[PDB]
Amino acid sequence: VTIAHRVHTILSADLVIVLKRGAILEFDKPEKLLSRKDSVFASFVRADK
């Protein structure tokens, strides 16, 4: 169970869980999360890459 300061390293995970200020936001596989573009994870991986 990983905590990531590098969203690019967590990319190889089986399931990614996103956290807002106190709750999960749509735990899912990384592919769908990055493809949705509505995920905050998309903003992360796009501002970091």
Binding site: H5, V7, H8, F44, A47, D48, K49
Partner: protein
């Protein structure tokens, strides 16, 4: 023209192995230069040697000494008032103070402190999280108002939001000074085409030095840099 060390040999113990050997370093006047390398490769050691913390087995350090602002790798605060240790015995300036803090993004973290700005923290006061310690350590050097500011892995306990904010605001403010050299080492090569000079090293020994027209000499090292897109 500024700080330079030709063929330096530095060590920790005068009987052990000469940890750093055959180094040639340059830091231009009023620029932004970074140092990178592997883990434990010796990226803080060169710096502490160029700060006078290592008996040089050989070589020659040349300056201009000066009250160089600094932030150790592990952030370290004082057993005193938050204002008192971010100021650090400087003539208090409301404008510069608030500007530095906004640059370090500490206002929402100050608001949660019981006495706000004048909260008495330290090893005797109330304790807090490593992110705030790191930000205070950076603010101490930013408010320091020294010619050669100097950082050591500030982007360690910081996420992407706060790292972006600090980098952008603080470092662009530093560059906004007519002449204010700042030297920060980091692991994220993300901000390479923002640094005016680059120093890469491995196993202590330096490899290359040059920002763009020198990063075109080989594809192995530059591909290693761009491995993370």
């Amino acid at each position: 023209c500024c700080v330079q060390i030709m063929g330096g040999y530095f060590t920790w113990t005068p009987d052990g192995i000469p940890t750093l050997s055959n180094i040639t370093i340059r830091i231009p006047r009023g620029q932004l230069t970074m140092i990178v390398g592997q883990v434990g490769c010796g990226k803080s050691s060169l710096l502490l040697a160029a700060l006078g913390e290592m008996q040089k087995v050989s070589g020659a350090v040349f300056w201009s000494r000066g009250p160089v602002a600094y932030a150790s790798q592990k952030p370290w605060l004082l057993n005193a008032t938050v204002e008192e240790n971010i100021i650090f015995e400087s003539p208090f300036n409301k404008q510069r103070y608030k500007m530095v803090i906004e640059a370090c993004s500490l206002q929402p973290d100050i608001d949660i402190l019981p006495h706000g700005d004048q909260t008495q923290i330290g090893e005797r006061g109330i304790n807090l999280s490593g992110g705030q310690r790191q930000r205070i350590s950076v603010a101490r050097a930013l408010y320091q108002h020294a010619n050669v500011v100097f950082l050591d892995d500030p982007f360690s306990a910081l996420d992407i939001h706060l790292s972006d904010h600090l980098m952008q605001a603080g470092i662009l403010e530093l560059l906004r000074d007519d002449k204010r050299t700042v030297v920060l080492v980091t692991h994220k090569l993300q901000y390479l085409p923002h640094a005016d000079w680059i120093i890469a090293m491995k196993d202590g020994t330096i490899q290359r030095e040059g920002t763009l027209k020198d990063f075109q000499r080989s594809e192995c090292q530059l591909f290693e840099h761009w491995k993370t897109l």
